[PDB]
Amino acid sequence: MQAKAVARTVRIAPRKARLVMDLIRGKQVGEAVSILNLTPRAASPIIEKVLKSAIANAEHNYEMDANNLVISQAFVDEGPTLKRFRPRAMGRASQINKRTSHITIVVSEKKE
Amino acid sequence: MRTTPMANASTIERKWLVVDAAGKTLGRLSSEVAAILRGKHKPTYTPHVDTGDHVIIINAEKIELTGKKLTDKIYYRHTQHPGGLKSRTALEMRTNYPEKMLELAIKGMLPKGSLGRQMFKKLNVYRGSEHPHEAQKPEVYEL
Amino acid sequence: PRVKGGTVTRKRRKKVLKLAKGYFGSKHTLYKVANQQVMKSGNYAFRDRRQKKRDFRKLWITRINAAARMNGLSYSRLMHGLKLSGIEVNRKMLADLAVNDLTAFNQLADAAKAQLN
Amino acid sequence: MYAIIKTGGKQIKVEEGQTVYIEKLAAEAGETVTFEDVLFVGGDNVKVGNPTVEGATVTAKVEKQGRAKKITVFRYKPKKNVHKKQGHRQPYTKVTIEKINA
Amino acid sequence: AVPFRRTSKMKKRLRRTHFKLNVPGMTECPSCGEMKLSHRVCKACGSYNGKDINV
RNA sequence: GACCGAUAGUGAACCAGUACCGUGAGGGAAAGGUGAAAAGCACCCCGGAAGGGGAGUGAAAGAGAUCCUGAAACCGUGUGCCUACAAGUAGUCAGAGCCCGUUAACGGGUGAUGGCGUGCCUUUUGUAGAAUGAACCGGCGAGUUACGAUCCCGUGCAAGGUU
RNA sequence: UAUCCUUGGGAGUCAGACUGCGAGUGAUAAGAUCCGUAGUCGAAAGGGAAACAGCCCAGACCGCCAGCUAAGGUCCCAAAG
RNA sequence: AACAGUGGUAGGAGAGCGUUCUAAGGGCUGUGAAGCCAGACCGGAAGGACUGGUGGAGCGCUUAGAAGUGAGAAUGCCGGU
Known part of the structure; x- marks a missing residue:
């Protein structure tokens, strides 16, 4: 059926993650994971991490096959937004947003 | 009613x-050609769905502006x-x-x-001879 | 004796956004701009009900006039000749019968010419 | 058969064996009405000129009264703030022809 | 000159898309069963004109 | 109590004259909800962790510790239709293809052609503006109450009404 | 009488704006200045004038794929000799 | 029945609708009330109401009287974005 995990509250922009997110969709798990592991990008090991736990959970806990999985679909949405002031010049202040976002992934079997 | 005989897209x-x-x-010739291209000629719908008649000229020669304006009607564009x-x-x-x-x-x-x-764009014109068409065997006509 | 708020206001609002539905994602997701679209759509409707009815005249006659010409006759003397032949316009609308049966329109065109000879 | 009948102040084209949207001139539910105000029979014959053909008389089986859906009417007057709304419902009747008697 | 409109989804998307992130030009190296870096030292068998380092 | 229900009712429902601000008296905020019962997840696995993922709990776990019902703006994912030769406050009217489908009118979905359409208030003679105001959505919010005066109109009495 | 008249209860408006007709100023530069009359716009659509508030046709309380018509046209766009 | 119709800003005049509340005659609801979203849903001129889904404990038709009684506008107001 499906292989599943989710990460909640993860410092990474929706915009930033969105790029990498679409690029792993429909892709063979075995290929996607390997790629991500060594890259100069920092969102790569994070989206990877969650993806690997989806595999992990699927096997160990409710029984699935990890040799049949691909990446069904995935998406990324902003979670809460925590505004913080950063003293901006001219007597002002700006609101930097240290984002905490919900990276969602639905792995699944499709080669079973 | 609320509708009437009309053209189809087929x-x-x-x-x-x-x-x-x-x-x-x-403007005697060109005007009456324009009518048929617009779909007016058919007993069926003129603008919504229409097919006109594509016309190819063989010989395009002398035009009459019947004065001195034949040689002095200056055309322009910007x-x-x-x-x-x-x-x-x-x-x-x-x-x-x-x-x-x-x-x-x-x-x-x-x-x-x-x-x-x-x-x-399917309408063409030339001053020598133009009609490579022979698929539809173009029918002669003069207005 | 204090008014409900919420729900009541959202009932009144829903009407506007429903009439403005199907447009964009900025023309009915935004209330104040949705308002503007409903004004247009309603005004358009009412004027065009009368505009369309006059446009049908300016449509059938265009078709007829061309067909008539392919039987050696012009619309002006067609219409006249029909009234001369029986005291019937027979509807310009219903002379759409030149599509359905070409034969009818042909003989009725000759019948028009008859009293104009 | 190609025929034409009077429907009050207008005329409608009518064949035979087909329903038509008409004005209510009284024609409710399952009854039978006729059009002796018929004025064309042919489509291979002519009956123009001849207002009202007496060689024919259409028979119709009344097939329900329907009602046209509401359609927005509105007056906005910009810079004057008017907001008069209406929706035009109005009933109308439907009949089905199936035999044009001679 | 500064924005005069809120900016619809259509405009914003036309801008931010037509281009998208792509994976590096990694090759699949069947001599270690994982991706390597094309014409660069592999991260699991050292492939780039000799293979001898699996780190 | 013909008082109000988390923007209402006192500045302040709640660990508020607190937080926060100026040298200073002083100015002066926001903030309700897991269950009926805590039984707030025994037991296990992966995530360095943050979290989840099975299982169990219980009526309910889309009640699982940041949670009542939780809209809308806002932002992603899947799907039907549609666009790479064109001219627009985006619809309206009318044909037309494709897809779908109504309990009933027998019906919805879309946009390929043709005609037509220049936001609202502000302010008027005229703003569609190159005049005034608005980032957007939601909720919130301005013709009042009392006592005289003058009319109204409903009734009881009416040469009587009234403490 | 979709007239006046009388009484009681609520008004709103005070550059109107624009055009034609008629009298006066410049014996007639000037979005120059005044009135008698009517019209329209104001406040009220649409038709014709390319569109072009106020000229000209005319007044929208609602659907009809019915017809006649005004100003104004009939070679095409812009229905139609 | 016949007969005529002018429905336009400022305003005048006539009826209604929803919202909260108190009242006396009545009635629904855990097998699903209030609130929430979709329906090619029906009935309105308009202001105005039915079924499925979610949700998980209260709700209301008539007859009357009362109001904090219906927002697209003053770099209006508060939260979200």
Whole structure:
């Protein structure tokens, strides 16, 4: 059926993650994971991490096959937004947003 | 009722006819051609879905403006480049490129947005001999 | 004796956004701009009900006039000749019968010419 | 058969064996009405000129009264603030022809 | 000159898309069963004109 | 109590004259909800962790510790239709293809052509503006109450009404 | 009588704006200045004038794929000799 | 029945609708009330109401009287974005 995990509250922009997110969709798990592991990008090991736990959970806990999985679909949405002031010049202040976002992934079997 | 006999989008005419512009006054010829291109000729719907008649001229020769304005009706357009306003007189337009003063003279008499200029392009004209068509065996006609 | 708020206001609002539905994602997701679209759509409707009815005249006659010409006759003397032949216009609308049966329109065109000879 | 009938102040084209949207001139539910105000029979014959053909008389089986859906009417007057709304419902009747008696 | 409109989804998307992130030009190296870096030292068998380092 | 229900009712429902601000008296905020019962997840696995993922709990776990019902703006994912030769406050009217489908009118979905359409208030003679105001959505919010005066109109009495 | 008249209860408006007709100023530069009359716009659509508030046709309380018509046209766009 | 109709800003005049509340005659709801979203849903001129889904404990038709009684506008107001 499906292989599943989710990460909640993860410092990474929706915009930033969105790029990498679409690029792993429909892709063979075995290929996607390997790629991500060594890259100069920092969102790569994070989206990877969650993806690997989806595999992990699927096997160990409710029984699935990890040799049949691909990446069904995935998406990324902003979670809460925590505004913080950063003293901006001219007597002002700006609101930097240290984002905490919900990276969602639905792995699944499709080669079973 | 609330509707009436009308054209469908599967209604295709698109007949090809020989016509000449040689010895023709123009605006007598071009106007009546424009009518048929617009879909008016059919007993069925004129603008919503329509097919006109594509017409190919073989011989395009002398046009009559019946005065001194045959050789002195100066045409104009304003096209992007720093030279702007380019002008070409009737006398020299008749000598070379008489195609394009009969082409824009049936576009000027047609309304229509997108589709109208598409069907229009299938109309051709030439001063020598033009009709490679033989698939539809173009029927002779003169207005 | 204090008004409900919420729900009541959202009932009144829903009407506007429903009439303005199907447009964009800025023309009915935004209330104040949705308002503007409803004004247009309603006005358009009412004027065009009368505009369309006059346009049908300016449509059938265009078709007829061309067909008539392919039987050696012009619209002006067609219409006249029909009234001369029986005291019937027979509807310009219903002369759409030149599509359905060509034969009818042909003989009725000759019948028009008859009293004009 | 090609025929034409009077429906009050207008006329409608009518064949035979087909329903038609008509004005209510009284024609409710399952009844039978006729059009002796018929004025064309042919489509291969002519009956113009001849207002009212007496060689024919259409028979119709009344097939329900329907009602046209509401359609927005509105007056906005910009800079004057008017907001008069209406929706035009109005009933109408439907009949089905199936035999044009001679 | 500064924004005069809120900016619809259509405009914003036309801008931010037509281009998208792509994976590096990694090749699949069947001599270690994982991706390597094309014409660069592999991260699991050292492939780039000799193979001898599996780190 | 013909008082109000988390923007209402006192500045302040709640660990508020607190937080926060100026040298200073002083100015002066926001903030309700897991269950009926805590039984707030025994037991296990992966995530360095942050979290989840099975299982169990219980009526309910889309009640699982940041949670009542939780809209809308806002932002992603899947799907039907549609666009790479064109001219627009985006619809309206009318045809037309494709897809779908109504309990009933027998019906919805879309946009390929043709005609037509220049936001609202502010302010008027005229703003569609190159005049005034608005980032957007939601909720919130301005013709009042009392006592005289003058009319209204409903009734009881009416040469009587009234403490 | 979709007239006046009388009484009681609520008004709103005070550059109107624009055009024609008629009298006066410049014996008639000036979005120059005044009135008698009517019209329209104001406040009220649409038709014709390319569109072009106020000229000209005319007044929108609602659907009809019915017809006649005004100003204004009939070679095409812009229905139609 | 016949007969005529002018429905336009400022305003005048006539009826209704929803919202909260108190009242006396009545009635629904855990097998699903209030609130929430979709329906090619029906009935309105308009202001105005039905079924499925979610949700998980209260709700209301008539007859009357009362109001904090219906927002697209003053770099209006508060939260979200």
